[PDB]
RNA sequence: CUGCUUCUGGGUCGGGGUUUCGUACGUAGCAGAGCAGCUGCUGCGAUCUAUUGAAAGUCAGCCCUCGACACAAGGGUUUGU
RNA sequence: CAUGUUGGAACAAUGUAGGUAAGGGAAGUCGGCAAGCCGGAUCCGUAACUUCGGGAUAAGGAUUGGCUCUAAGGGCUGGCAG
RNA sequence: CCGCCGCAGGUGCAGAUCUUGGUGGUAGUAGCAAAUAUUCAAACGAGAACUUUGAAGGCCGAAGUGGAGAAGGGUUCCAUG
């Protein structure tokens, strides 16, 4: 019902346009928490330190253009803020992106 | 929560900098309680405080590069910036002779 | 600087004695008119003379 | 300035179309200035040729999807002749 | 070391600091101011004038990558070997 | 503390770009723009853009943002709260 897991591809290029040299990789981070928070309705997002390798792998100017996610849903654990339920946004390792839908994955 | 005073001991015991300590990022609580050396010396020998490896700096292509030097590759007219007597001097040529 | 007289480290280790705070038992007392310590001496601020 | 269910609508991702650049990596070759090493097979070699108008990017303010995938009848503040 | 005593969101005018511009080319302007050209090395070649030292990197040209060879320039042990 | 009768004066303020102290409008305004840069999780904690740890990405690039001193400073050192 609500402890779901289901993969995406993320075009970070499209969300990525325009933004300057010394803010591209830091501003990727932010679009794939908004994503998080829009697919997966939690306002608590904490995203996992193999993605931001992934997103800052070129460095900061260079970032790339599609990404695979797993996005999971989960349960909050204690000490409970507001937000009863989080997402964990692990990288998927991906040679390429072509012809990859939106996979609804099960536990 | 602070864990400064352990990293500048560590690495005043290591005899690296603290560019290189490396304190056990989840045993926070056991560093934080050495408070002097003789303690770090503990921590040391039971691998929490690790001395990090030098960040490799290899001149591979380098050799490779002077490999082809040795040949005399990249060492025609555009690779030479210096005037003939600054690249391989005359007096150090009459001293030779 | 790291080299000193014995006359300036003298002068030195009485300004040191000099700026403590007030004890907490003066203020308590009959006359008490002492609130702080109006003469303390920082190191930044004030540059002591010499 | 617009959109937020005619059992449908936008979003996202994918695929098309468009278009930019100019032929990807790997692999193969009696192609390659040669040179080294083994008695013609074997290394090294920029490059060239084939695969390959290939590869890569393409709305973020490009175009068409009817293909996956969720999501969408909710919240807040006010307003009476 | 943590961007120099702050962050976030935008990407308007006007700035400040960098660029680029078709065709012309100083017509701009007090004035080529600012910018731009030129720029390293090697090989040629180098005028007036000169106090014969200079001028001079005058001016003016050609060349430059990568690869793969060829030749030349030496130590050391007993006109040649190792 | 004051009325009346005398006495005495450092005896009356709006000003002097007066003196001292206090408070406004401007105004929640100008501003917080020199030397490329932060990011992710975690910890402590009422509280984290800033602390600490780890991982990443960067910078100084040995005429350094490095390791030591002299002048000068004088406890700024170190720990703990």
């Known amino acids: 019902n609500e402890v779901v897991t289901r993969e995406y591809t993320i075009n970070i290029h ?94 | 929560s602070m864990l400064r005073l352990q990293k500048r001991l560590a690495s005043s015991v290591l005899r690296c900098g603290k560019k290189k300590v490396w304190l056990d990022p989840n045993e926070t609580n056991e560093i934080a309680n050495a408070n002097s050396c003789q303690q770090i010396r503990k921590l040391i020998k039971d691998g929490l405080i690790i001395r990090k490896p030098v960040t490799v700096h290899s001149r591979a292509r380098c050799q490779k590069n002077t490999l082809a030097r040795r040949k005399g590759r990249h060492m025609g007219i555009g690779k030479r910036k210096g005037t003939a007597n600054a690249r391989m001097p005359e007096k150090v040529k009459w001293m030779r002779r | 600087s790291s080299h000193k007289t014995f006359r300036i480290k003298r002068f030195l280790a009485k300004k040191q004695k000099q700026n403590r705070p007030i004890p907490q038992w003066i203020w308590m007392k009959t006359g008490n008119k002492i609130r702080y310590n109006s003469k303390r001496r920082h190191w930044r601020r004030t540059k002591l003379g010499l």
């Open chain 1, 14 to 107: 499209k969300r990525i346009h325009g933004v300057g040299f010394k803010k591209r990789a830091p501003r990727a981070l932010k679009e794939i928490r908004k994503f998080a928070m829009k697919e997966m309705g939690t306002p608590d997002v904490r995203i996992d330190t193999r993605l931001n390798k992934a997103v800052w792998a070129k460095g900061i100017r260079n970032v790339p253009y599609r990404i695979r996610v797993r996005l999971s849903r989960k349960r909050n654990e204690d000490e409970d803020s507001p937000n009863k339920l989080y997402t964990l946004v692990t990288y998927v390792p991906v040679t390429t992106f072509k012809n990859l839908q939106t996979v609804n994955v099960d536990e």
